[PDB]
């Protein structure tokens, strides 16, 4: 195998296409991956069985070197001195051999999901356009994702489900006393508890999905919250904010408490059957012959080892094993998909034409197009128009042959250059986009880029032909993205151009201008067809189309459609002045014009209130799984003695569990307040401070540092106290029996503490990779998903297949140096301990064992040590990372006249003043307004009066200085209408009032003042009616009614209009201008314009730059020096 990408998928490629070829009814992924894998998997798999078979041998040489030293024969001091070597050697092989056959297996899963992913990418590329519809978009990023961190280590167990059952039977072929078969009373013992394991495991599962819908939920509420905290602080909604955070939290803790019980009681059982196999184990001992600790300690061992083979090893790989090929049938179905089926080119050729054809999208469909006849010359212009969904750009689908027909034919000539409706952003090079995948030539570069108007705003640009496009397109307005599509479609060299919706959102000046300077000269001669509105357009095409509901309204001659649908064209020209309607109403009138011519509980109280109900219970649990086992014993089938002492264990274990309950109840506590609180400190945050992260770490870390917070604090703590427990009663017995152990011991543990910091160090500092290498995989994703319809029409798939493959490399190499470092240390790790274990075996070989079951316990207890180490190691690492993050959470937490006088503004007590000394006078009920450049801080004058900014000087509101006034009130007086206007997600009663103190009825004559209540008797539940998506389904004019409706629920004085005018057509703007003067008639309205016709009914102006200003008493005064000063 390969260690690339580009190598990894063409082997999967060839043994796929090999299987998938030889069609033997349904060929499979999973053969064909076999065929790769096996190969090495199997070598790797019987390195690691000699490895852990050596476990079974280990105790069969203490027991020889026990008996050394018996009284029995002979003080043969050799023997025990070479056995004790070859036991030490046991534990080194073991060790040099297991851990490198590990690091192979993950290298495998490597392999593997890196020629899956390529697999995957390649059929996205080519899928029916039909299916398309019907695929999910969260399935393709979940069939990617959803495996990423767990099919490449799943493959660690995956020879155990093999193994396990030959230690199992070596394990039970090996006891001795076979026939007083105490064999079975172990084995039924660790059978109970692997089948209540499973349960209860699967009781964990039910839990983790139901928390997660719920998780969702709170993160989309937050978010909202988190990117608009001007507008709540504006609003002084504040806590009702908090609140609806804390129902959200609530429903999650209360589902998180009991998952955390289900975790609490797992770990509890496991040490629990710690205890019973190797209690059970000396049952023989005791009943009858006695004890022989040449045997006992021999026994023990072996209990040990088949206690963690039989829990923990086998079900490990089963349940992995049996996941990862779910797994795989998933994506299997995926690429049995249908296909986009490739276009034939052909010389037949020079025009376009179209032969009876009749198509649909799908079975069901009525969306059939009827009828569809063209021919169309080389060079002619076709002009289409119609109604909104009569295949107006489906037309387009069957002409490119994303389409096929039911019926008819298609004949065209050579290649089609598309630009679709909706452009594609190609986050990149700008030059590049407008050449992408084409030769550069100045010559026609030039030529295209000037008459589409480009360099007007390209030349700006602060790298001029390199700036780059970033993603959100930062750079570049919706009509100016559209513009740049044009560019793209027209530079490409094409025999058929396809123009959807070229309008563009343009102003009509440059609409003009571009129909001419492109649709007519650049485009000279080329066999063009364009999407339009505008009736001069068909005035100027050899061919007219109209169509309407599936079929052609009208096909030919400008004069022959007013010829033979006259009233149809008189209708639409009673709106002679068509270039004056913007697309969306140009749209509405043919709509209209179209169709018009239509041609248990007494005693759960009780349990809840004794403890000692409680205490039962679990007792009873403990009683009930040794029952189990005996009816498991009971097998032989085909002694008070005994049953006190074991009765006795039990009593004692469940005591032991009882005692720890409190600490889960801690637990949930302690995360709930930790949680409230960071919220609390976030609302109530100072401004400018919040700036150090902009949201970016504030919904990470809010998010991620809560999670783990409840994941992993209520887990990693309960391992760690078993693992306290053990080892302390360790390291006391062997220093009492043999104090130079503990001579020796000291310098060991030293050794960890060394390494272990150094390593958490860098590997902390690596794990940030993954994530930087992980996020463009995805973006690259998306971008190209979206691309889809351009990507084929251009035939740019290997140029993103390529830059998949280098971004798949690149994630690649730092997730597998993660993987290297942390193998590395592991098998340091373990060495050292090792080494240790050599010294003491010897310790306890070399001083006087004169009393030969002292060596014993030492030496079984140095034997059998090895398990607890290698969890204490893991844990540290988890509470190393825990306490990072709490760190990163504490971090957080540990006056009708307005009279300004001399006020200053800054975004930080540093960086720059925004505004300096301004004094400003606004007359009792005076229209006022300010003008200014764009980004001269007209927004920082509005949040200088809403306390957002560090700020000097003196404001005289309400008769009072600012300096009197807290937030809530001097913010209070003030509604403010924002051009980014809040919408809060839920009931429209909520959203315009979070508080509940306003009656519906008082609501609906508001709704009726505001001209909102047919708006809310549309949307169906009225009050009632959930708004979603930020507001997705109303007008941004709405959103400001809404706002208004707020402003005057809520009494304010000062009204502030953020340019309603930068969004709002002036159809609607007169009606909300009217509707507010009659609102506000007794209050003072202060409006941000862009333009003199709307500051112009003001009565006192403020016009600002360079952080001054100039007052005026009247639009003439202002229009004198404005022209003077018209710059
Ligand atoms: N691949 C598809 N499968 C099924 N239905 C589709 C598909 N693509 C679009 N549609 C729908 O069927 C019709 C397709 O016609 P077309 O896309 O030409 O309409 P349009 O008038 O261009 O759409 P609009 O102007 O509303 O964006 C639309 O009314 C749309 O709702
Ligand atoms: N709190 C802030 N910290 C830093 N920079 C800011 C802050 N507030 C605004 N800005 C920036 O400084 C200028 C502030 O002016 P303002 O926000 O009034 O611009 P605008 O003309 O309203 O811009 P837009 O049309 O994008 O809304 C802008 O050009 C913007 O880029």
């Given at each position: 195998?390969?260690?690339?990408?580009?190598?990894?998928?063409?082997?999967?490629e060839?043994?796929?296409?090999?299987?998938?070829?030889?069609?033997?009814?349904?060929?499979?992924?999973?053969?064909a991956?076999?065929?790769?894998?096996?190969?090495?998997?199997?070598?790797?798999?019987?390195?690691?069985?000699?490895?852990?078979?050596?476990?079974?041998?280990?105790?069969?040489?203490?027991?020889?070197?026990i008996?050394?030293?018996?009284?029995?024969?002979?003080?043969?001091?050799?023997?025990?001195?070479?056995?004790?070597?070859?036991?030490?050697?046991?534990?080194?092989?073991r060790?040099?051999?297991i851990?490198?056959?590990?690091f192979?297996?993950?290298?495998?899963?490597?392999?593997?999901?890196?020629?899956?992913?390529?697999?995957?990418?390649?059929?996205?590329?080519?899928?029916?356009?039909?299916?398309?519809?019907?695929?999910?978009?969260?399935?393709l990023v979940?069939?990617?994702?959803?495996?990423?961190?767990?099919?490449?280590?799943?493959?660690a167990?995956?020879?155990?489900?093999?193994?396990?059952?030959?230690?199992?039977?070596?394990?039970?072929?090996?006891?001795?006393?076979?026939?007083?078969?105490?064999?079975?009373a172990g084995?039924?013992?660790?059978?109970?508890?692997?089948?209540?394991?499973?349960?209860?495991?699967?009781?964990?599962?039910?839990?983790?999905?139901?928390?997660?819908?719920?998780?969702?939920?709170?993160?989309?509420?937050?978010?909202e919250?988190?990117?608009?905290?001007?507008?709540?602080?504006?609003?002084?909604?504040?806590?009702?904010?908090?609140?609806?955070?804390?129902?959200?939290?609530?429903?999650?803790?209360?589902?998180?408490?009991?998952?955390?019980?289900?975790?609490?009681?797992?770990?509890?059982?496991?040490?629990?059957?710690?205890?019973?196999?190797?209690?059970?184990?000396?049952?023989?001992?005791?009943?009858?012959?006695?004890?022989?600790?040449?045997?006992i300690?021999?026994?023990?061992?072996?209990?040990?080892?088949?206690?963690?083979?039989?829990?923990?090893?086998?079900?490990?790989?089963?349940?992995?094993?049996?996941?990862?090929?779910?797994?795989?049938?998933?994506?299997?179905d995926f690429?049995?998909?249908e296909?986009?089926?490739?276009?034939?080119?052909?010389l037949?050729?020079?025009?376009?034409?179209?032969?009876?054809?009749?198509?649909?999208?799908?079975?069901?469909?009525?969306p059939?197009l009827?009828?569809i006849?063209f021919?169309?010359?080389?060079?002619?212009?076709?002009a289409?128009?119609?109604?909104?969904?009569?295949?107006?750009?489906?037309?387009l689908?069957?002409?490119?042959?994303?389409?096929?027909?039911?019926?008819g034919?298609?004949?065209?000539?050579?290649?089609?250059?598309?630009?679709?409706?909706?452009?594609?952003?190609?986050?990149?090079?700008?030059?590049?986009?407008?050449?992408?995948?084409?030769?550069?030539?100045?010559?026609?570069?030039?030529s295209?880029?000037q008459?589409?108007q480009?360099?007007?705003?390209?030349?700006?640009?602060?790298?001029?032909?390199?700036?780059?496009?970033?993603?959100?397109?930062?750079?570049?307005?919706?009509?100016?993205?559209?513009?740049?599509?044009?560019?793209?479609?027209?530079?490409?060299?094409?025999?058929?151009?396809?123009?959807?919706?070229?309008?563009?959102?343009?102003?009509?000046?440059?609409?003009?201008?571009?129909?001419?300077?492109?649709?007519?000269?650049?485009?000279?001669?080329?066999?063009?067809?364009?999407?339009?509105?505008?009736?001069?357009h068909?005035?100027?095409?050899?061919?007219?189309?109209?169509?309407?509901?599936?079929?052609?309204?009208?096909?030919?001659?400008?004069?022959?459609?007013?010829?033979?649908?006259?009233?149809?064209?008189?209708?639409?020209?009673?709106?002679?002045?068509?270039?004056?309607?913007?697309?969306?109403?140009?749209?509405?009138?043919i709509?209209?014009?179209?169709?018009?011519?239509?041609?248990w509980?007494?005693?759960?109280?009780?349990?809840?209130?004794?403890?000692?109900?409680?205490?039962?219970?679990?007792?009873?649990?403990?009683?009930?799984?040794?029952?189990?086992?005996?009816?498991?014993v009971?097998?032989?089938?085909?002694?008070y003695?005994?049953?006190?002492?074991?009765?006795?264990?039990?009593?004692?274990?469940?005591?032991?569990?009882?005692?720890?309950?409190?600490?889960?109840?801690?637990?949930?506590?302690?995360?709930?307040?930790?949680?409230?609180?960071?919220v609390?400190?976030?609302?109530?945050?100072?401004?400018?401070?919040?700036?150090?992260?902009?949201?970016?770490?504030?919904?990470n870390?809010?998010?991620?540092?809560?999670?783990?917070?409840?994941?992993?604090?209520?887990?990693?703590?309960?391992?760690?106290?078993?693992?306290?427990?053990?080892?302390?009663?360790?390291?006391?017995?062997?220093?009492?029996?043999?104090?130079?152990?503990?001579?020796?011991?000291?310098?060991?543990?030293?050794?960890?503490?060394?390494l272990?910091?150094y390593?958490?160090?860098?590997?902390?500092?690596?794990?940030?990779?993954?994530?930087?290498?992980?996020?463009?995989?995805?973006?690259?994703?998306?971008?190209?998903?979206?691309?889809?319809?351009?990507?084929?029409?251009?035939?740019?798939?290997?140029?993103?297949?390529?830059?998949?493959?280098?971004?798949?490399?690149?994630?690649?190499?730092?997730?597998?140096?993660?993987?290297?470092?942390?193998?590395?240390?592991q098998?340091?790790?373990?060495?050292?301990?090792?080494?240790?274990?050599?010294?003491?075996?010897?310790?306890?070989?070399?001083?006087?064992?004169?009393?030969?079951?002292?060596?014993?316990?030492?030496?079984?207890?140095?034997?059998?040590?090895?398990?607890?180490?290698?969890?204490?190691?893991?844990?540290?690492?988890?509470?190393?990372?825990?306490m990072?993050?709490?760190?990163?959470?504490?971090?957080?937490?540990?006056?009708?006249?307005?009279?300004?006088?001399?006020?200053?503004?800054?975004?930080?007590?540093?960086?720059?003043?925004?505004?300096?000394?301004?004094?400003?006078?606004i007359?009792?009920?005076?229209?006022?307004?300010?003008?200014?450049?764009?980004?001269s801080?007209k927004?920082?004058?509005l949040?200088?009066?809403?306390?957002?900014?560090?700020?000097?000087?003196?404001?005289?509101?309400?008769?009072?200085?600012?300096?009197?006034?807290?937030?809530?009130?001097?913010?209070?007086?003030?509604?403010?209408?924002?051009?980014?206007?809040?919408?809060?997600?839920?009931?429209?009663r909520?959203?315009?009032?979070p508080?509940?103190?306003?009656?519906?009825e008082?609501?609906?004559?508001?709704?009726?003042?505001?001209?909102?209540?047919?708006?809310?008797?549309?949307?169906?539940?009225?009050?009632?009616?959930?708004?979603?998506?930020?507001?997705?389904?109303?007008?941004?004019?709405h959103?400001?009614?809404?706002?208004?409706?707020?402003?005057?629920?809520?009494k304010?004085?000062?009204?502030?209009?953020?340019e309603?005018?930068?969004?709002?057509?002036?159809?609607?703007?007169?009606?909300?201008?009217?509707?507010?003067?009659?609102?506000?008639?007794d209050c003072?309205?202060?409006?941000?314009?862009?333009?003199?016709?709307?500051?112009?009914?003001?009565?006192?102006?403020?016009?600002?730059?360079?952080?001054?200003?100039?007052?005026?008493?009247?639009?003439?005064?202002?229009?004198?020096?404005?022209?003077?000063?018209?710059?």
């Open positions: 195998s390969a260690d690339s990408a580009d190598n990894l998928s063409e082997k999967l060839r043994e796929w296409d090999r299987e998938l070829a030889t069609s033997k009814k349904k060929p499979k992924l999973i053969n991956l076999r065929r790769c894998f096996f190969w090495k998997f199997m070598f790797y798999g019987i390195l690691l069985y000699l490895g852990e078979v050596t476990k079974s041998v280990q105790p069969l040489l203490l027991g020889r070197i008996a050394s030293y018996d009284p029995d024969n002979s003080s043969e001091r050799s023997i025990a001195y070479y056995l004790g070597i070859g036991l030490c050697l046991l534990f080194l092989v060790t040099l051999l851990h490198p056959s590990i192979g297996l993950h290298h495998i899963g490597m392999q593997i999901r890196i020629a899956l992913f390529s697999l995957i990418y390649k059929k996205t590329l080519k899928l029916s356009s039909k299916v398309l519809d019907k695929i999910s978009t969260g399935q979940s069939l990617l994702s959803n495996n990423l961190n767990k099919f490449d280590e799943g493959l167990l995956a020879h155990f489900v093999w193994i396990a059952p030959l230690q199992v039977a070596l394990l039970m072929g090996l006891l001795w006393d076979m026939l007083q078969a105490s064999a079975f084995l039924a013992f660790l059978i109970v508890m692997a089948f209540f394991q499973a349960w209860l495991g699967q009781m964990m599962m039910k839990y983790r999905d139901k928390r997660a819908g719920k998780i969702n939920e709170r993160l989309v509420i937050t978010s919250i988190i990117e608009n905290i001007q507008s709540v602080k504006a609003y002084c909604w504040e806590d009702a904010m908090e609140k609806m955070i804390e129902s959200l939290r609530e429903t999650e803790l209360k589902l998180t408490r009991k998952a955390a019980y289900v975790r609490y009681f797992n770990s509890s059982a496991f040490f629990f059957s710690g205890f019973f196999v190797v209690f059970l184990a000396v049952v023989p001992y005791a009943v009858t012959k006695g004890i022989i600790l040449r045997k300690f021999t026994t023990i061992s072996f209990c040990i080892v088949l206690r963690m083979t039989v829990t923990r090893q086998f079900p490990g790989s089963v349940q992995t094993w049996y996941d990862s090929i779910g797994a795989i049938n998933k994506i299997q690429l049995l998909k296909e986009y089926k490739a276009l034939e080119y052909n037949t050729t020079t025009g376009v034409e179209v032969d009876k054809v009749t198509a649909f999208w799908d079975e069901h469909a009525s059939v009827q009828d006849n021919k169309i010359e080389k060079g002619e212009l076709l289409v128009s119609g109604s909104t969904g009569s295949g107006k750009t489906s037309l689908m069957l002409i490119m042959g994303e389409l096929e027909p039911s019926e034919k298609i004949k065209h000539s050579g290649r089609i250059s598309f630009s679709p409706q909706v452009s594609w952003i190609m986050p990149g090079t700008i030059k590049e986009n407008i050449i992408f995948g084409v030769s550069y030539d100045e010559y026609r570069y030039k295209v880029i008459a589409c480009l360099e007007e705003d390209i030349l700006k640009f602060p790298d001029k032909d390199y700036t780059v496009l970033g993603e959100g397109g930062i750079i570049l307005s919706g009509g100016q993205r559209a513009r740049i599509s044009l560019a793209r479609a027209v530079y490409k060299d094409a025999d058929l151009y396809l123009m959807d919706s070229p309008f563009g959102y343009l102003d009509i000046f440059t609409e003009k201008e571009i129909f001419e300077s492109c649709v007519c000269k650049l485009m000279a001669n080329k066999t063009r067809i364009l999407v339009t509105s505008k009736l001069e068909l005035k100027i095409a050899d061919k007219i189309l109209i169509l309407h509901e599936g079929s052609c309204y009208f096909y030919g001659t400008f004069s022959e459609l007013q010829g033979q649908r006259p009233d149809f064209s008189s209708e639409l020209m009673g709106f002679d002045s068509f270039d004056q309607f913007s697309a969306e109403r140009r749209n509405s009138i709509t209209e014009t179209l169709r018009r011519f239509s041609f509980n007494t005693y759960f109280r009780y349990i809840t209130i004794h403890k000692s109900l409680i205490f039962v219970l679990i007792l009873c649990v403990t009683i009930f799984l040794l029952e189990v086992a005996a009816s498991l009971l097998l032989l089938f085909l002694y003695m005994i049953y006190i002492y074991v009765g006795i264990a039990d009593t004692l274990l469940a005591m032991g569990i009882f005692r720890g309950l409190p600490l889960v109840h801690t637990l949930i506590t302690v995360s709930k307040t930790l949680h409230q609180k960071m609390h400190a976030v609302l109530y945050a100072p401004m400018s401070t919040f700036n150090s992260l902009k949201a970016g770490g504030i919904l870390r809010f998010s991620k540092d809560t999670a783990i917070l409840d994941d992993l604090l209520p887990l990693t703590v309960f391992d760690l106290i078993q693992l306290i427990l053990i080892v302390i009663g360790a390291i006391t017995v062997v220093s009492i029996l043999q104090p130079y152990i503990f001579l020796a011991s000291v310098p060991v543990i030293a050794a960890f503490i060394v272990r910091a390593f958490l160090h860098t590997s902390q500092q690596l794990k940030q990779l993954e994530s930087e290498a992980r996020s463009p995989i995805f973006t690259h994703l998306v971008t190209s998903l979206k691309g889809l319809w351009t990507l084929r029409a251009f035939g740019r798939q290997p140029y993103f297949e390529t830059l998949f493959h280098k971004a798949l490399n690149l994630h690649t190499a730092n997730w597998f140096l993660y993987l290297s470092t942390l193998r590395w240390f098998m340091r790790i373990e060495m050292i301990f090792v080494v240790f274990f050599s010294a003491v075996a010897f310790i306890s070989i070399i001083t006087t064992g004169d009393g030969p079951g002292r060596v014993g316990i030492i030496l079984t207890l140095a034997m059998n040590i090895m398990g607890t180490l290698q969890w204490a190691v893991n844990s540290s690492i988890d509470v190393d990372s825990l990072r993050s709490v760190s990163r959470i504490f971090k957080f937490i540990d006056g009708g006249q307005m009279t300004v006088t001399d006020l200053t503004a800054r975004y930080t007590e540093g960086g720059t003043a925004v505004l300096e000394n301004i004094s400003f006078s007359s009792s009920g005076q229209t006022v307004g300010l003008l200014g450049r764009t980004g801080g927004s920082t004058l949040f200088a009066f809403l306390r957002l900014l560090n700020t000097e000087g003196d404001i005289q509101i309400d008769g009072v200085s600012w300096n009197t006034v807290s937030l809530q009130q001097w913010r209070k007086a003030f509604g403010v209408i924002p051009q980014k206007v809040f919408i809060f997600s839920g009931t429209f909520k959203n315009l009032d508080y509940g103190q306003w009656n519906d008082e609501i609906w004559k508001v709704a009726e003042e505001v001209g909102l209540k047919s708006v809310i008797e549309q949307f169906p539940g009225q009050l009632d009616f959930v708004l979603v998506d930020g507001g997705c389904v109303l007008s941004h004019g959103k400001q009614l809404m706002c208004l409706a707020r402003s005057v629920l809520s304010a004085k000062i009204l502030l209009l953020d309603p005018s930068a969004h709002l057509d002036p159809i609607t703007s007169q009606v909300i201008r009217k509707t507010l003067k009659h609102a506000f008639a003072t309205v202060v409006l941000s314009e862009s333009r003199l016709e709307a500051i112009l009914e003001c009565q006192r102006f403020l016009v600002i730059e360079d952080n001054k200003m100039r007052q005026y008493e009247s639009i003439q005064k202002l229009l004198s020096e404005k022209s003077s000063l018209r710059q």
